[PDB]
Amino acid sequence: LNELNLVQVLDVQKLAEQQLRQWETQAGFHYLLQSIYLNLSNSLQIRWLAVIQFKNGVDKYWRSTRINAIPKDEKASIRGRLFEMIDEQNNQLCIQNAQASARIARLDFPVEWPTLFEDLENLLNDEIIRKDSVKIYNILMHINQIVKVLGTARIGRCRPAMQSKVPLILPLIVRIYLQSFEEWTTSSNSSLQVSYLALKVLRRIICEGYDRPQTDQSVCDFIKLSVSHFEMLISNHENFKKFDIYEKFIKCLGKLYFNLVTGSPANFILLPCSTQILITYTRLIFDKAPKVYRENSDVTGDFWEQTAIRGLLILKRVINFIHKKGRSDKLTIDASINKINTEFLNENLITRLVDTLMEWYLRLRPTELENWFMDPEEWINEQMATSYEYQIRPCAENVFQDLMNTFSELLVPYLLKKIENDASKLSNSLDDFLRKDAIYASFQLSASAVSEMVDFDRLLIQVFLPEATNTNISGDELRIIRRRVALIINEWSTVKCSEESKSLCYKLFTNFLTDEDDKVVLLTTVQTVRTMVDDWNFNKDTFQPFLTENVHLLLRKILPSVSLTETRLYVLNTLSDIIIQTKPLISRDLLVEILQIIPNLWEIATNNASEAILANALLRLLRNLVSSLGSQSHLTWDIAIPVVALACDPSSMQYQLLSEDGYELWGMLLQNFSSHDQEFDDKFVELVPFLKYGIETHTEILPTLLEIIKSYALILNPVDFFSNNTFQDIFKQMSKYLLKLREDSFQLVLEIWEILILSNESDYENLLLQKFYETGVLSALFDAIFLEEAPSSYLCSQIIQIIARISYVNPDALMTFLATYHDNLPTSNENARMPESIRKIVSKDQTYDSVVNKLLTGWIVCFRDIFDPKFKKVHILGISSLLRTGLVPILTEFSSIASLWIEMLEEINETNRGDCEKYHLNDIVTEQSIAFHPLTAEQLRYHQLCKNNDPVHNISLKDFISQSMEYLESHLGVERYQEFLKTINPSLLENLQMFLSIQPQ
What we know:
Elements: H1 13-17, H2 21-24, H3 29-38, H4 44-61, H5 72-80, H6 91-107, H7 118-128, H8 133-150, H9 158-165, H10 170-186, H11 192-207, H12 217-237, H13 248-263, H14 265-269, H15 274-287, H16 289-294, H17 303-323, H18 336-343, H19 347-361, H20 366-374, H21 376-384, H22 392-406, H23 412-420, H24 431-445, H25 456-469, H26 476-493, H27 499-515, H28 519-533, H29 544-561, H30 565-581, H31 588-607, H32 612-629, H33 637-647, H34 655-671, H35 683-687, H36 690-695, H37 702-715, H38 718-723, H39 725-736, H40 743-759, H41 767-774, H42 777-785, H43 793-808, H44 811-823, H45 828-833, H46 853-865, H47 869-883, H48 888-892, H49 894-907, H50 937-949, H51 951-954, H52 957-971, H53 974-983, H54 986-996
Helix pairs in contact: 3-4, 4-6, 6-8, 7-8, 7-10, 8-11, 10-11, 11-13, 12-13, 13-17, 15-17, 17-22, 19-22, 19-24, 20-21, 21-28, 24-26, 25-26, 25-27, 26-28, 27-28, 27-29, 28-30, 29-30, 29-31, 30-32, 31-32, 32-34, 33-34, 34-37, 37-40, 39-42, 40-43, 43-46, 43-47, 46-47, 47-49, 47-52, 49-54
Family: Belongs to the importin beta family.
InterPro entries: ARM-like, ARM-type_fold, Importin-beta_N
Subcellular location: Cytoplasm; Nucleus
């Protein structure tokens, strides 16, 4: 079966017939599909279907190594007949075959198809001398896709090989371009499409082909000449032919030059014609500045705008290269500069460019003033994403700032003297007021350069505050200069700017927010206020007068009046930023006001899809309220708990988008909850189950989730906590994967277990222990430390610390469950079978773990590795409380345990209650707070837990030792105890007890 097998098979015909998968993998299927495309006597649609499926099959099975492979015979035949259909003009076939060829070339080039680019070289030789410029066009399309794809190989030597070979192609391509260019320069024929594609391909080949392209002389030749073509195209765009496509080549050539200077300013500059390009674009910038300025995209098109942007961006790349220096590590960077410094970057060009920018490019364009008028809010909504790379005035602002920062060219008098001169004009009629606005714009931009030469503190009160309160100007003129003063304050507040000047500015912007209705001025103000608040040197004290009012105005005027999604987003995030910077001052009334906007906007965000981002912001906001509000944070519950309930609920759409921010909010809600100030709302426990779904999906945030769990361990009772089923299941999983956890979440798990042990006072005679056993915690702890492939003694002590905490509280049950653990172990034979690092050093078919010796003798050796005073004492208390069991093997090692006792007793100097400043080093809570995090309710909960129920700081080591011995004397018979005191080597004990019984004050 063959010919109609891939035709009839194309709901009824698409569904049923479809039994072609059986043929997809056949040795000949793909050459057949290719043949079908090649044979131009088949229906155009049959050919197209065949080439579609053929490219898809290249991707599916081209690789012979993978199953369902195709043989080398078929692959070679196919590879042979890939550029045969260059005689077919149809682009819908040509580009598909080109993608198939590009994929085959990516998979098979430096090996398996080394003749590429040499096959192409002869294709170009054979068709460059041919009427069929159609064949040339299709060859060029295939080269386009092939060069593209091969240039994207970051691995191996495929891309290098291409770079080496494609010089054999470059000159031929150039010839093609040149010929066709000339052809249609003056005639009315339209081979232009071929010249266009040839220039695109040349851009590729130059860029992803040649490192230091200035060294291949043919590339240098072509670039220069293309510059001449560019200049022609420019001057005759203004002359004869007035068509859209007359700009396409200008764009492509600009793109080439720009890609070259971006890829390497050094390689670009060292082009013979680099300065030709630079000066050409500089002349365009200087001479055509009025055309750019007066341009009105809507009526004409943004050609002049875009071309000016292009030239300025090239100049920016160059300026950056000069500002610093940077595969040369010296040679290439020691000459390149100098070429351009002397052949282009002369003083009287840099300053001239500055003048030009100041007059024509920093000026508010007429079109911008017209747009401002009709829809201001959208005029600045577009600028919330001010993409300087697509807008001439922003671009120019940026390039000017780069110029000012790259040189010490204090031409401040040009501003002093152009204030005296050309700003001293009109100021009633617009043009010399807009010029003045551009002058002030230059002052703004140069903030980072001339703060040492300028008394800004003076100027604010001297000049700008007058301007912005001046009552003798149109109203529009007022808006312009007011926006401009706001922007100036913005750039200068983060440099030379007294906090007093900043208070003045806070007042000024409050006045704007109160008075102005122009939304450009309002939003410019908002952004300047924000940036002064997010300033690293933001002295919040100076802003707390204006705080109340400004939050009110953002809440009551701005955020309501704005109706563009991301402007609302900006206002929400500003309010949040302000709250984070001003945690001292906040009123409950203000808090209520903020909470008032929250649910409205939440309704919006969760209903209307396109507003979902706001929800995230809202979460942020609420979160920053909670932690900012602190131990009054429960006031947000009315709103915050429901919000969490919806954002962390894995049944709503919006879980996918909000869950994480929600979980963070939930965390904070618990961390800033103060039982001293409120009853713990029951709902937080009803939410708990959501955690599980997070754990079983976003493991990327598992720490966060664990923190939440930690919070409950510090809030709830152990009765409560261990009753929770979700917490039990989570513990089950953590035990299943304890040693697999990432260190951060591993530590969190152990911390949680430690918090439960401590806070679970003691009354539990089996609650917590029955729960740890039930949920596999107990078993996992011992499984880890008895692994033959032992863990890092550091991590081993991390684990054992938990065991020591337990040992202190009911060591008998510990041992009991050790026994249980022993009974339920695998057989020693089964242990011998198991893999690399899950073999254990104990087994069921074994003694009673050499009477607990394995455990205790390993632990008293870990101890030698311990160094932290606090943790050292935790461990010794574990060991001693274990001694209290009087079990044979434990009791056996009394010699060593008493040696440890003597060691530490001679070391440490404890108080009455057994605390020591050396036990409070890693202590979390102290009087450094204010500069970092003023202490949260949870930090204090934890601190009081440790203070009150952590043996370390309450019990004396001395007392514990003596009372342990008393427990032995009572648990053992005094007969047995006195016997023991001499059964364990009585001479070494004579000695040891000589030192141990030394009990001073």
